[PDB]
Structure 1
Amino acid sequence: LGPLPPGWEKRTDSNGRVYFVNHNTRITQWEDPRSQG
């Protein structure tokens, strides 16, 4: 999908669910920010 926008990091939780972390805003979400964009 190209690179993540600046500040974002992809992580996996303890159950293995992928999520996305914005280190600027300190917001986490399930949705890939590149799918929004």
Structure 2
Amino acid sequence: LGPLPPGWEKRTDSNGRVYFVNHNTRITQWEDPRSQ
């Protein structure tokens, strides 16, 4: 539901686990920012 907020990108690590990266703050996190 809804686009990611600007700056954010969804990726998958080398084991297949989905995470989210915020290119403004250079933080990566497991949690979908749209859930927050």
Pairwise TM-score range, normalised by the shorter structure: over 0.9
Unaligned runs of 5+ in 2: none
For residues 1-37 of structure 1, give each alpha carbon's deviation from its aligned partner in whole angstroms, at most 9, with x where no partner exists. Answer: 110000000000010000000000000000000000x
What is the Cα-based RMSD across aligned positions, in Å?
0.3
Aligned residues: 36
Unaligned runs of 5+ in 1: none
- Identity among equivalent positions (%) equals 100
Give the whole-Å Cα distance in 1 for the aligned partners of 2:26 and 2:13: 16
